[PDB]
Paper text:
Steroidogenic acute regulatory (StAR) protein related lipid transfer ([name]) domains are small globular modules that form a cavity where lipids and lipid hormones bind. The ∼210 residue globular [name] module is a curved β-sheet gripped by two α-helices. The concave face of the β-sheet and the C-terminal α-helix enclose a hydrophobic cavity that can accommodate lipid molecules. Here we present crystal structures of four human [name] domains, those of STARD1, STARD5, STARD13 and STARD14/[name].
Group 2 consist of proteins containing only a [name] domain; group 3 proteins are capable of binding different ligands, such as phosphatidyl choline (STARD2/PCTP) and ceramides (STARD11); group 4 proteins (DLC, or deleted in cancerous liver cells) are frequently de-regulated in cancer and contain Rho-GTPase activating domains; group 5 proteins contain two [name] domains; and group 6 consists of only STARD9, a 4614-residue protein with unknown function, that contains a kinesin motor domain at its N-terminus. Of particular interest in the scope of this paper are STARD13 and STARD14, the family members for which the ligands are not known. STARD13 Arg974/STARD14 Arg449144 is highly conserved and is likely a key residue binding negatively charged lipids such as phosphatidylcholine and fatty acids. Based on our structural analysis we propose charged lipids as ligands for STARD13 and fatty acids as ligands for STARD14. All structures reported are relevant to disease. They are down- (STARD13) or up-regulated (STARD5) in cancers, mutations in them result in metabolic disorders (STARD1) or they are linked to obesity (STARD14;).
Residue numbers in the entry:
A (entry chain B): 352 to 366, 375 to 592
B (entry chain A): 346 to 584
């Protein structure tokens, strides 16, 4: 199944950014967040695998092989929200984040980041991304905390030969409070063309780097479970 | 139209911040226990509450498209809204069609399914409704709703179809669905002539769907209008 499933997915899915403008920062931010929420609610998510109560789902759209991972972590959702919404700290737990640079603090809950990523799948250059991150605290009615990521273009931050400029359409974290010191943590990625080989390898079960990274995510949250620094920034 | 989109986006942020602390069951009777000994008053109160909501003086007209109107009331504990249009159907027939909650899934995508739980009397019934997951959720919602319908007492008065959440020992919350509550919703229908009816839908407080309400009210989405349009086409198809 594995090798064959991988090759089928590759054959199916082989071969996204929006211009940023200060005059539409509020709308772009809404759309960033709203897109992630809508992705969560799509009706055709299918469980691909489970390993140690951690679940990997896919959505095989006509355009995209979307995936998401879910786990339950013994950390407070508000704390998980501050820890995960600071993308500067993501290189610490996520190997796929080689570096992170804050381009533009847009407001309290929105920022543009320059992200670089190690090359994977034969490339002799790393990838880079210019990403709008938009975070929202929910109403206390059971809605999730949301940290939404989508690629944006800026006249000053176009691609240079140092990196393959990639794009991500709709990615990020949702966190649902499940109890005192219990959070359901999910990471979603709708479409990131430049890493499809890597996705299909993971989704088919030839690799478990997604599981490994999500384990390091949990450990990062637990290790920083009770840090005050996030809430005082 | 960038400017107008930016305004909408700002309005949603304002509203969301304003109601970020949801109204609780201790503060307002989002649901009430179903008590068959009190069935008469429970239905009376359901109708009277919707009549009072209608008569509130602080409704503000927030938008209009094709002479369909969306009003809002930014109350202190919750954000109430109501939609209003006039349809080329007899009020008496609209009354039968809109009181039949089991038919509501045919025109309202928010009603995924409806089960009649108890017919209390000719004009009052309790239903179990399921609703599709909105953005940010993976489980559908369910509700247990008392629907009480009344004809107009005098001329000028509306037909009233009042909905309010109730609880029952046979339909307690289950892990399969996120249980929602509605405080006071439903339809008022006024005769505007021969086969003209003013059709209004009201929703005082459904705290579980706040984000969806703010998106629509802010004008970033038009799903309220799309559903109300389908409502119209349902009524026209069923004359
Ligand atoms: Cl959910």
């Amino acid at each position: 199944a594995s090798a064959r499933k991988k090759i089928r997915l590759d054959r199916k899915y082989i071969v996204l950014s929006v211009p940023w403008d200060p005059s539409n920062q509020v709308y772009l931010s809404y759309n960033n967040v709203s897109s992630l929420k809508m992705l969560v609610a799509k009706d055709n998510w299918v469980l691909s695998s489970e390993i140690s109560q951690v679940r990997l789902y896919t959505l095989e759209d006509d355009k995209f092989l979307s995936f998401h991972m879910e786990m339950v972590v013994h950390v407070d959702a508000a704390q998980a929200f501050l820890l995960l919404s600071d993308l500067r700290q993501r290189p610490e737990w996520d190997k796929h984040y080689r570096s992170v640079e804050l381009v533009q603090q847009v407001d309290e809950d929105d920022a543009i980041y320059h992200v670089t990523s190690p090359a994977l799948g034969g490339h002799t250059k790393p990838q880079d991304f210019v990403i709008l991150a938009s975070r929202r605290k929910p109403c206390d009615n059971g809605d999730p905390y949301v940290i939404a990521l989508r690629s944006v273009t800026l006249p000053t931050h176009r691609e240079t030969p140092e990196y393959r400029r990639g794009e991500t359409l709709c990615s990020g974290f949702c966190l649902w409070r499940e109890g005192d010191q219990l959070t359901k943590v999910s990471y979603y990625n709708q479409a990131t063309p430049g890493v499809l080989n890597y996705v299909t390898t993971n989704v088919a079960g030839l690799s478990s780097e997604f599981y490994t990274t999500f384990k390091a995510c949990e450990q990062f949250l637990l290790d920083n479970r009770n840090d005050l620094a996030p809430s005082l920034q």
